[PDB]
């Protein structure tokens, strides 16, 4: 029961990873959800600056990941994804993090072709009047300071919960001694009110808000505001009849209000195409809901239900009267709506427990998706007509999967193989952000097709006594993979969205071995591969082969760890192609990074941990990081470097 620092998370059951995000993590995360995914093999992160990275799973970017918080969807507003869904999540304020790899669930929404990520808080369990406090403080290099408070009180009949955090860092340094533009601040406060009139009934109301700022080495602008407001209502009814085990009902409202500019966290670049102050303000308003029934009987479990979603995007921008040298801020103009999305779906998942060592799971959903272009004009001696103003388009998209899981007779082994098909309607960035659509189209909104993935997943679990191992591989094809291509034109850079066909394959594996009662070791490996077979070319933005080796010594109340991370070169690139955020340009160099950690339980209630990240102060960058901005002194296509040696200390309280 000795405390330790988390450097990797294993796969605990076929395709699924479950972890407590309150444990200290050894490459210390920045209070965002992308960094908490770095310890799960198969995840990589596009670095923008000090925080708010964009998560990449098995080489898949963006909405191919379905990222939920308490069952709801929080979508960002930045047309350049400065505020990806994970940038609104502070994972320490949650209780559980679940990842399901591959298109192997239908219960949580449309289009999760790459995987599903679920951040959860679990309702209190008070049986008598009482209270609960969890908290933590973290301090480290470069002004890093974090506070987290999670308190609740209640009784058999109901409860009140408050969770909040405040977190910040100054600019960090790379391993060559340069200050990287990358300071950030984040804070959140949320309340939950729970009513439990009896054991079979839970009704819970939630409301919360947060804000932040972030300096972006890899952008022409910084994020000076990331406002979030959230409202939720969920209802669980248990043991309704002998076969109706559970009924779930949930609605959520999430509002993002984002500002980026070139003068609040930097000064305007004199040699850029924005030498004058400029700010843009955008928001995203999201309303959605879910209703699901769970039936159990004989050797069968059936989960059935429907879900719905609507979201809306608006924007307004500042103006700079050159002649009088006068600046009118963006909040002096009306909001201007530009897009509305809708989705309605019906879904079901049946499970058969054949005998005791055999499981068969099948799932299906049908989705009705639609979008409307509300842009009355476009940008380009200022504006131009939008040829699809007020147009609508829609599609209906079936998805499903089958999965077989067999447990061996002799060893504690599970084998599994699964077939999944997933169809995803294009998202805001794929339709509204490209400057051009496919050749011969009027724009991207009018022509980009839905993306259709067919994938075979397979793997094994070995749950031995000294040895714990797992592996998970996948082969698939993507029809109408949505791809970005980049051109110069001496107008800045400009993008084109196209549909192409693709092959993908890869996998993750890992093991941990209890050497002695004190000594444990573990390792992991992750590989992704992709081909643009429409163009006989590699897919862009695929992270290279990556390995982790850990060693831990634990002894009563304390433990000590060492971690090695070793990353291969990525020589498979597609220059000037990528997504809405990034593009390939050069092959990447391989590297190794080394870290140490320790932990110590002082009392039942107080536990301590500390680490040194990147002990040897290695100067390195990752394949997927953004190119640095010229106005900060970055040449060429020099990508943002990773941090050099950093120290941190954490104390966890629990009462
Ligand atoms: Cu932005």
Author numbering: 66 to 445, 449 to 723
Sentences from the paper on this structure:
Here, we show that Pseudomonas aeruginosa OprC is an outer membrane, TonB-dependent transporter that is conserved in many Proteobacteria and which mediates acquisition of both reduced and oxidised ionic copper via an unprecedented CxxxM-HxM metal binding site. As indicated by the successful structure solution, OprC contains a single bound copper and shows the typical fold of a TBDT, with a large 22-stranded β-barrel occluded by an N-terminal approximately 15 kDa plug domain that, like in other TBDTs, completely occludes the lumen of the barrel. The copper binding site comprises residues Cys143 and Met147 in the plug domain and His323 and Met325 in the barrel wall. The CxxxM-HxM configuration, which coordinates the copper in a tetrahedral manner, is highly unusual and has, to our knowledge, not been observed before in copper homeostasis proteins.
Interestingly, the active site His117 in azurin renders the copper atom solvent inaccessible, reminiscent to the likely role of Met147 in OprC. The superficial similarity of the OprC binding site to that of (pseudo)azurin prompted us to generate the M147H and M325H OprC mutants in an attempt to convert OprC into a unique, blue copper transport protein. However, in the presence of added Cu(II), both mutants remain colourless, and comparison of the crystal structures with those of pseudoazurin and plastocyanin show small but most likely important differences in the geometries of the active sites.
